[PDB]
């Protein structure tokens, strides 16, 4: 019923260099629909069910920043994305505002740019849960977590 976030994280990690490069050169989440390697990656995670499609597009597009940009770290809730971006000490607060205010597709593009810069260490299944809904509530909590960390 729910996407196995760690399984997908592992699948992306041990992906062959070819399939990985084909996914990484995508410039926005919807372009993943043109990549055969993308479909094979997310098929065992419920892609053919339309319920999961928008979530899987966000998850994989965030991962597509690189195999080594998002480092999963186990809980001791676990490190949220907002706290993780602040933990890097590289991201200006203004860029977080611009992220949480952005509309569709543009938000994912800006997020991935932030992930590239920040190289966050976080709780990946927790971030995936956030990417699944990605409502106005999740976006405000992102900004507030970032601010509460700094």
């Amino acid at each position: 019923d729910e996407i196995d976030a760690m399984a997908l994280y592992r699948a992306w990690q041990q992906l062959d260099n070819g399939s990985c490069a084909q996914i990484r050169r995508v410039s926005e989440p919807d372009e993943l629909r043109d990549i055969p390697a993308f479909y094979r990656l997310v098929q065992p995670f419920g892609w053919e069910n339309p319920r999961h499609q928008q979530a899987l597009l966000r998850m994989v597009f965030c991962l597509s920043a690189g195999k080594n940009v998002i480092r999963h770290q186990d809980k001791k809730t676990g490190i949220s994305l907002g706290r993780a971006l602040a933990n890097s000490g590289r991201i200006n607060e203004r860029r977080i505002f611009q992220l949480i205010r952005a509309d569709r597709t543009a938000d994912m593009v800006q997020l991935r740019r932030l992930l590239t810069h920040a190289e966050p260490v976080l709780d990946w299944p927790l971030m995936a849960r956030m990417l699944t809904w990605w409502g106005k509530r999740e976006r405000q909590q992102l900004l507030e977590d970032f601010v509460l960390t700094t």
Partner: protein, 352 residues
């Protein structure tokens, strides 16, 4: 007809003409779709600060909250007409604040001021204390002929058009102005998903990479501009001006609404586009055409042609359904038809 409705469809090339606290394009939800927006206050300030306004209407008002700085301006400007003492008391009575020599004296809020209007007031103040007339009774006297005060707004027309409020001083009683022009926020006739410019700043002392990487929102858009002018209110706000005087001012607004574009980001985006359609209509009740674009316009050889077409179709629907027959004229580059804007303006000048 007391109202002059003005309708403009103007298309802009990629630009960022109006942005918010996070430097992102202003927008609005209309018909369930995001439209790029230019605030009415941005439009009004672009017009009042323009060369055309200066040449054809006069001096824009002085809007400030810093009375100590204002004090010094009036002393330099009204010095050869009044003594410094009278100038200080006049500002003090109007603002309700103690005007001394303090470095910082602040009003209640930002307030538009007209020098010519202040000049008129200090005459009264001088004559008041000369006739040994105190301030409480001076106010009582001045409240009896507000029209004589409003004649000074011919030196500050943007106040007659856009209004003024005050919560302290004699301006509370004497300077209450209900603007004659109503104006909407410019919105795009269509849905816009804004573009993002990823830029760098190359450093001449840094050989590896750039010193700054950033993003900037921008987009194109066909915008609908709407405004109307209450002629009777405009005459009253100018101290009892004639209809010809009001009509000529309205004509300059028509021109500015079709040609004036906010300066923001124009040095690096240069969207200096004039309107492709202007429509003026006299009416008894104000009529906006915005619902021509409630269903967002789909592109079809551009957004401009289907926007103008959507405007025309909705205009007919309203006119036929509500039986409207006020005078109307239309200028276009793509109801009396006007080949040029100038002919359109003569039309308005001549009461339609």
């Amino acid at each position: 007809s007391n109202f002059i409705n003005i309708h403009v469809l103007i298309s802009h090339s990629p630009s960022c003409l109006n942005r918010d606290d996070m430097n992102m394009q202003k927008d609005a939800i209309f018909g369930g779709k995001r439209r790029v927006r230019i605030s009415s206050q941005s439009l009004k300030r672009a017009m009042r600060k323009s060369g055309y306004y200066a040449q054809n209407i006069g001096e824009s008002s002085l809007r400030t909250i810093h009375l100590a700085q204002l004090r010094d301006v009036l002393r330099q400007k009204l010095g050869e007409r009044f003594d410094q003492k009278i100038i200080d008391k006049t500002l003090a009575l109007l603002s309700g604040k103690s005007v001394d020599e303090a470095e910082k004296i602040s009003a209640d809020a930002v307030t538009p001021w007209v020098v010519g209007e202040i000049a008129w007031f200090c005459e009264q103040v001088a004559k008041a204390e000369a006739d040994n007339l105190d301030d409480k009774k001076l106010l009582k006297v001045l409240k009896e002929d507000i029209a004589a005060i409003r004649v000074n707004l011919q030196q500050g027309v943007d106040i007659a058009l856009s209004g003024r409020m005050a919560t302290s001083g004699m301006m509370t009683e004497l300077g209450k102005v209900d603007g004659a022009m109503s104006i909407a926020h410019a919105i795009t006739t269509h849905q816009v998903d804004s573009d993002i410019d990823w830029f760098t700043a190359v450093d001449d002392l840094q050989e590896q990479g750039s010193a700054h990487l950033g993003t900037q929102e921008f987009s194109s858009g066909v915008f609908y501009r709407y405004a109307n002018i209450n002629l009777a209110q405009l005459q009253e706000n100018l101290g009892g001006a004639s209809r010809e005087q009001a009509l000529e001012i309205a004509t300059h607004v028509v021109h500015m609404l079709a040609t004036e574009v906010p300066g923001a980001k124009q040095r690096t985006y240069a969207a200096f586009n004039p309107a492709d359609m202007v429509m003026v209509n006299f009416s008894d009740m104000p009529l906006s055409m915005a619902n021509a674009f409630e269903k967002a316009v789909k592109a079809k050889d551009g957004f401009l042609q289907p926007s103008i077409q959507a405007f025309n179709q909705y205009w007919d629907r309203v006119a036929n359904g509500y039986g409207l027959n006020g005078a109307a004229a239309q200028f276009s580059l793509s109801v009396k038809q006007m080949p040029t804007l100038e002919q359109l303006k003569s039309w308005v000048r001549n009461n339609g």
